[PDB]
Ligand binder design. Structure first.
Ligand code: HEM
Ligand code: HEM
Ligand code: HEM
Ligand code: HEM
Lengths: 146, 141, 141, 146
C-alpha cells in the first residue's frame, strides 16, 4: 500500500504494543457478534448464540490468533501484500469459499478493536494509516479469487 | 419506497417478461457469476458452467420470487417473509451481493425489453430491486 | 430493527457520552475527512483543518441530531424526517458516505468509552447508526 | 486493468459500433434520473424535474457525449487509465468536488445503456469485460482525490 513513512512508522510503532493473542481473539469474536451472518463459516466452532458464547469460545479465540499472526506478517511486507497473501487468497477462495467482503468487515472491526485498546493514542492520523493497511490486506486477500 | 408510478411501471415491465422470467432469471445469474466472480463463493455446490441445469433451475426460483414480489408489491414483507428468514438465517449471503444481482437483472431486462426499458422504467425497477433486497436482508441482525 | 437490548445498550452508551457528544461528533468528522478523503467533497466551503470551529460547529450539530434520535429511539423516522428531507433534497450526499461516518463514530466511541464498549454494546451501536443512516437516505428517490 | 485479449478484443469490437453522441446522452441522462442525487452537480443545466425534462435537455446530452468521449480514449490506454485520467482526476476532485462514487454509478448506468442498445450482442461475457473496464475507469478517475 502507499503509506507515507511517518504513516508506516506509526503503523509499526503501535503495532508493537498490540497483544496479538488477545487482539486476534477479540477482533474475530467481535466480527461474529456484530455481523452474525459471518458465523456461516464457523458452525464447527460450537455455541456462538451469545456474545459471551462467542467472545470466550476457545476455537474462536484460537482462530483469532492465527488470522492476526497472519495479518502481523503482511505488516512486515507492506510493499508486497499480494505475494504475502497469495496462498491465503487461494485458500480462502478455492477451499473455504469466503466472500472477500468478510475481509473488509474484519478490517473495520479490527480498526475499532485498536481504537478501543489504544484510546487517545489511536489518533485520526493513526487511524487513517491503519485504514490504508486493512484495505490493502482485504485487497491482497481477494486478489486470487476467480 | 414504491410510488404508484413505480409500481405501475414494474407491473408493466414484468408482465412483458411473462414467459421468460425463468430464462431471464438464469441469464441474470450467469451475468453475475462472470461479472462478479466473488458471488460464486455462495454456489460452490452448483455446477456453474454455461447452460448448467442448477443455474437454470435456480434462475426460475429467483424469477418466480420476483414475480411474487411484483404481485404483492404493497406487502412484500409478508409476501417474502419466508425468503428473508432463509437468506438471514441459513444462507446468510453478505448484503453487498444483493446489489450485484440486482444490477445483472437490470442488464438482462434492458437487453431483452429494449422498448420498455425507458429511463423511467429503469428508475422504477431499480427502486423495485432495491426494496426486494432490503426486505431479504431486513432480518440479518 | 432495534431490539429492547439494542435500545438499552444505545441509551446507556450514549448516556456516558453525555457531555462530549459535540466534542466526539467533531472528532468523528475529523476521523472521516482523514481516512475517507472522498468525504471532503461535500464540505468544500469549510475549513477542514485541525480544530477548525467550522468542524467543531458541525460536529456538535451532528451529535445533537444523534442525541435526539436516541431520545426518540421509538420514533426515529418522525424525529429526523426534517434531516432526511434535507440530506435527500438539498445536500444530496451519496448514501455510501453515511456508512463511513458511522464507522468513524464507532471508532470515536470506542476510543472514549473503553469500559462500556463491549461486543454487545458495539453490536447495538452499529445497528443504531445504520438505522439512523437508513432514515436519513429514505427520501433520496 | 486486467483484460484478456479476448476480453480486450470484445471490448474494442462493440465499442466500434458506439454512437457516442446518443450513448453518452443516454448514459448521463439515465444517471440523473435513476440516482437523482447526482443532479446536485447540474442545476445550471436547467429543468431536470422529469426524466423527459432530463433526457431531452441539451445540456445533459452534450455533457453526456463529452464524458463518453473522454471514456472512449482511456480504451486506447487500457494499460494506463491511471496516467490517462490523472488530470481529470484532479479536476473532478480539486474543482468539481465530485464524489468518486458517482463514477461507479456511471459505469453501471453505462453497462445498462450498452445492453439496452446491443441487446443479444451484449453477452454475459461481453458484459464481464466491460464491467472490468468501467471499474478501472472509476478507479483511475478517483485516483488523484486527496
Ligand atoms: C482478514 C484477513 C484474514 C487472514 C490473514 C486470515 C488468515 C487465515 C489463516 C492463516 C487460516 C488458516 C489456514 C489453513 O488452515 O491452512 C485461515 C482459515 C480460515 N479463515 Fe481466514 N483469515 C482472514 C480473514 C477471514 C475472514 C474475514 C473469514 C470469514 C469470516 C475467514 C474465514 C476462515 C475460515 C472459515 C478458515 C478455516 C478455519 C477452520 O475451520 O479450520 N478468514 N484464515
Ligand atoms: C433479488 C434478490 C434474491 C432473490 C429474489 C432470491 C431468491 C431466492 C430463492 C427463491 C431461493 C430458493 C429457496 C428455496 O429452495 O425455496 C434462493 C436460494 C438461494 N439464494 Fe437467493 N435470492 C436473491 C439474492 C441472492 C443473492 C444475491 C445470493 C448470493 C450471491 C443468493 C444466494 C442464494 C443461495 C446460495 C441459495 C440456495 C441455493 C440452493 O440451495 O440450491 N441469493 N434465493
Ligand atoms: C448519521 C449521520 C449524519 C447525521 C446525524 C447528520 C446530521 C446533520 C445535521 C444535524 C446537519 C445540519 C443541519 C442544520 O443546519 O440544521 C447536517 C448537515 C450537513 N451534512 Fe449531515 N449528517 C449525517 C451524515 C452526513 C454525511 C455522511 C455527510 C457527507 C459525507 C453529510 C454532509 C452534510 C453536509 C455537507 C451538511 C451541510 C452543513 C453545513 O454546510 O454546515 N452528512 N447533517
Ligand atoms: C465517470 C467517468 C467520467 C469521465 C471520463 C468524465 C469526463 C469529464 C470531462 C472530460 C469533463 C470536462 C472538463 C473540461 O471542461 O475541460 C467533465 C466535466 C464535468 N464532469 Fe465529469 N466525467 C465522468 C464522470 C462524472 C460524473 C459521474 C459526474 C457527476 C454526476 C461528473 C461531473 C462533471 C462536472 C460537474 C463537470 C463540469 C462540466 C462543465 O460544466 O464544464 N463527471 N467530465
Amino acid at each position: 500500500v502507499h503509506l507515507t513513512p511517518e504513516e508506516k512508522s506509526a503503523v509499526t510503532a503501535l503495532w508493537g504494543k498490540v497483544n496479538v493473542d488477545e487482539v486476534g481473539g477479540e477482533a474475530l469474536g467481535r466480527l461474529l457478534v456484530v455481523y452474525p451472518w459471518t458465523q456461516r463459516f464457523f458452525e464447527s466452532f460450537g455455541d456462538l448464540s451469545t456474545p459471551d458464547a462467542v467472545m470466550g469460545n476457545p476455537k474462536v479465540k484460537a482462530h483469532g490468533k492465527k488470522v492476526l499472526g497472519a495479518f502481523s506478517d503482511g505488516l512486515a511486507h507492506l510493499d508486497n501484500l499480494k505475494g504475502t497473501f497469495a496462498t491465503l487468497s487461494e485458500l480462502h477462495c478455492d477451499k473455504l469459499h469466503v466472500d472477500p467482503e468478510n475481509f473488509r468487515l474484519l478490517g473495520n472491526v479490527l480498526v475499532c478493536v485498536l481504537a478501543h485498546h489504544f484510546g487517545k493514542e489511536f489518533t485520526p492520523p493513526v487511524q487513517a494509516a491503519y485504514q490504508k493497511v486493512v484495505a490493502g490486506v482485504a485487497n491482497a486477500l481477494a486478489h486470487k479469487y476467480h | 419506497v414504491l410510488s404508484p408510478a413505480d409500481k405501475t411501471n414494474v407491473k408493466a415491465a414484468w408482465g412483458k417478461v411473462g414467459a421468460h422470467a425463468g430464462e431471464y432469471g438464469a441469464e441474470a445469474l450467469e451475468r453475475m457469476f462472470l461479472s462478479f466472480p466473488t458471488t460464486k463463493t455462495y454456489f460452490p455446490h452448483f455446477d456453474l458452467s454455461h447452460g448448467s441445469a442448477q443455474v437454470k433451475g435456480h434462475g426460475k426460483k429467483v424469477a418466480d420470487a420476483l414475480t411474487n414480489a411484483v404481485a404483492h408489491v404493497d406487502d412484500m414483507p409478508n409476501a417474502l417473509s419466508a425468503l428473508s428468514d432463509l437468506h438471514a438465517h441459513k444462507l446468510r449471503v453478505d448484503p453487498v451481493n444483493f446489489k450485484l444481482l440486482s444490477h445483472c437483472l437490470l442488464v438482462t431486462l434492458a437487453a431483452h425489453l429494449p422498448a420498455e426499458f425507458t429511463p423511467a422504467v429503469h428508475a422504477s425497477l431499480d427502486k423495485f430491486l432495491a426494496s426486494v433486497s432490503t426486505v431479504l436482508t431486513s432480518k440479518y441482525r
